[PDB]
């Protein structure tokens, strides 16, 4: 599963966790602790969207 940020579209893909932010290998992002915030673009978890339809 991903989670797109409404602000611009930035994807977090969740099979794999993120990389740029130093996070755990399949990491849910609707688990992931407040260290985790994207840029000014976008930040909390409350602020994204998952892919789902």
Do not use: M, Q, R
């Amino acid at each position: 599963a991903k989670w797109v940020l409404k602000i611009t579209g930035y994807i977090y893909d969740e099979d794999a966790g993120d990389p740029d932010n130093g996070i755990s290998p399949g990491t849910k992002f609707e688990e992931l602790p407040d260290d985790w915030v994207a840029p000014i673009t976008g930040a909390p978890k409350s602020e994204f969207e998952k892919l789902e339809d």
